[PDB]
Structure formats: structure tokens, C-alpha cells
Structure 1
Amino acid sequence: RQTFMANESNIERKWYVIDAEGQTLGRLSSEVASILRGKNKVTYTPHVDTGDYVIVINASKIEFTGNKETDKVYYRHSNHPGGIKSITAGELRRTNPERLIENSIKGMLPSTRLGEKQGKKLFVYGGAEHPHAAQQPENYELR
């Protein structure tokens, strides 16, 4: 047995700044998901977090295809009888653009105690100004 194992004494996490200006929603969330999980590092370990931090700017300028701006709706239940609400994807982009990308990427992560910790390394903004300049974020191009 000689397989390597990563611990919290040799892991390095960096900060990225991705831009969502003119990008497809589903095809952009699938790439950010692998970064938050650390699927791009050669020292990947399953039982420990090894991903990095990601910052999404220009979220309000995401793109859809076809008529999905009206046919795609989001439901939610309040646990009360008959308490089911709804909202269309087109109306949500115009009010809460950050919750649109935040929930689209959270659904591509595992629903475990470690997956909830990896989903907090994400930051989404509707403009181009982020307050995390101290973290020294580095630009990233989608593949």
C-alpha cells in the first residue's frame, strides 16, 4: 500500500474570479462545480475538502436558450396545506440574479455534510464589484 492521502496540513486553496457575462446557465454551473470539489487537482482526496474559492460577477447577464424564460418555473412548499408557491426563471433573473446561479450550482453538488461545506466557498454578485480584493482573486477562463 503506497497511495497518497491529503490532509489539512498540506492542502492549498486559492481564490478565483469567474465572469458570467454572456454564458449559458447550465454549461457554466457544471464547470464551477468541479472547481469547488477539487476535481482538477492531482492530490484529490474524497474524504477531505480540496477545492478552491470562486467568485461570480455579472450574474444578471446570464443567457437562456429557446422559450425557457417562461416555460421553466421554480416551485417551493411551505409545509402548510396548499402552501405551494411558484416563480418563472425570467422573473427571477430580474429580481434575484444571485439566487438563480446559487441554486443552479448547489444542485450539482453532493448532499452530504462535506458537500454543504464545499458550497459555502461560492460568491455571486449581480455587478462587477466584489468586496474580496484582500483575498487577491485570480481570473479564470472556462474550458
Structure 2
Amino acid sequence: SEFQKVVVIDAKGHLLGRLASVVAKQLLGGQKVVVVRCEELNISGHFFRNKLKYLAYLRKACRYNPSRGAFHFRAPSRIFQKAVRGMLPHKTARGQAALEHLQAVEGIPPPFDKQKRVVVPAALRVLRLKPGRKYCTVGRLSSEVGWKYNDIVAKLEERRKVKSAAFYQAKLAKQKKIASAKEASPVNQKLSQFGY
């Protein structure tokens, strides 16, 4: 709980509204936020109801120049951005600057796949939803509302998980070597009465 320049949030298993509210409060506090893996955000309510909610959202359009009408964004990252910006005073310079401090992406791009990704417990579905309750996935609602990049993200995420697993195995082996040398070192038992 210390002020970092950039917080990378792995949005897997989170709730859209709860994560948006927490992020919107951090941006007004003046913190750069990168919400990666937005195709895994969870929304309460069963999938058919959520798709009806979204398909009702498409209905809002101008009767003159739908080019000026409401802009319906189908990407899961843009869905999260719409949720976040609705919780911000974006009509003012403060809120407009706050939006510039948020980077919502699909998947985990290489500039952010090699950085620690914290999670928000106040938005996690496992901790915040009663078991036995129906929910949906934004990355699934997006595919059946118009989003057309689901397959590429899934493929590029399988590659990323494979590479990350290889990296962790190498780091775990090095950590095992360091861990083995730990008790071999003597001061770790000689004067460890301080609790370390």
C-alpha cells in the first residue's frame, strides 16, 4: 500500500463496477493505472441478461447523424474504460487528465508482462460474490456483441503463459539454489532471535 508510479492490475476474476470504482478513485488521486487482461473481467448477472443490457446500450443513437450519435465500444478494455469514465468528472480538466492516467489493454502486452501485477480484493468475484450466483465474462459478451479479436488474444495469451511458465521455472530453480544456501549460511541460525 505505497504510492507507485504505475500500478498494473491483472483484471482476471474482478468485478467490472468494483474495479472501475477503485481505479477511478486512484486516478483522481494521481496514479497511473494499467489494467491488463480485460477479457477476464466478471460481471454479476447471467450472460443473457448482460447481453440484453449491452444490446439495449446499442439502441441509444442519434436520429440525425449517428456518426455524432453514441459511440458503442465493443472491446473489453473499452468497456472497462466506459465504466471507469462514467465514475469520473470527465467534463472538467481534472477528470480529463485523470482519464489520460489510465491504460486499459487486451491481454498483457510485452511492456507489461515482465512487471508485477497486483490485484484488488475489493473487486474480486471470489471474495465478493455469493457462491451459486450466475455471472458473465466481458471477453465473452464482447465476442457476441461485435468484438472480433478474441482468437488472436487467446493465442497470444497461450504463448505468454508458456513463456512465463518457463521463466518462473528458471527463477524457481535459482531461488531453490539460494534457498538451499540459506540455512547453510550460519548467521541465519546463530543470531536469529530477532525473528528473521
Normalized against structure 2, the TM-score is what?
A: 0.48
Choose between structure 1 and 2: higher helix proportion.
2
Residue 108 of structure 2 is matched in structure 1 by 128
Structure 1 residues 132 and 62, CA gap change in structure 2 (3 angstroms): closer
> Any unmatched runs of 5+ in structure 1?
1-11, 39-50
Alignment of 1:17-56 (within 5 A): 17-38=8-29, 51-56=30-35
8 A Cα contact 1:16 1:137, kept in partner? no
8 A Cα contact 2:11 2:119, kept in partner? no
Mapped partners of 1:52, 1:112: distance in 2: 18
Amino acid at match of 2:28: R
Please tell me whether Structure 1 or Structure 2 has the larger radius of gyration of its CA atoms. 2
> Percent sequence identity over matched residues?
29
Name the SS of the counterpart of 1:71 in structure 2.
Answer: helix
The answer to whether structure 1 residue 63 and structure 2 residue 54 are counterparts is no
Runs of 4+ in 1 over 4 A off after TM superposition: 83-87
Residue 140 of structure 1 is matched in structure 2 by 118
Amino acid at match of 2:52: T
> Any unmatched runs of 5+ in structure 2?
123-196
Mapped partners of 1:109, 1:85: distance in 2: 18
Mapped partners of 2:14, 2:8: distance in 1: 15
Mapped partners of 1:139, 1:128: distance in 2: 10
Mapped partners of 1:23, 1:114: distance in 2: 27
Name the SS of the counterpart of 2:43 in structure 1.
Answer: coil
Choose between structure 1 and 2: higher strand proportion.
1
How many residues of Structure 1 are paired with residues of Structure 2 in the alignment?
111
Query: Which range moved further: 117-126 or 59-68?
Result: 59-68
Name the SS of the counterpart of 1:108 in structure 2.
Answer: coil
Mapped partners of 1:117, 1:31: distance in 2: 17
- For residues 88-140 of structure 1, give each alpha carbon's deviation from its aligned partner in whole angstroms, at most 9, with x where no partner exists: x9xx3xxx12211111101111121121011101111111225358xx96543
8 A Cα contact 2:31 2:101, kept in partner? yes
8 A Cα contact 2:8 2:112, kept in partner? no
Name the SS of the counterpart of 1:109 in structure 2.
Answer: coil
Give, in angstroms, the shift of residue 71 of structure 1: 2.8
Mapped partners of 1:53, 1:86: distance in 2: 25
Give, in angstroms, the shift of residue 19 of structure 1: 1.2
The one of 69, 81, 85 aligned to 1:106: 85
Residue 77 of structure 1 is matched in structure 2 by 62
Amino acid at match of 2:65: H
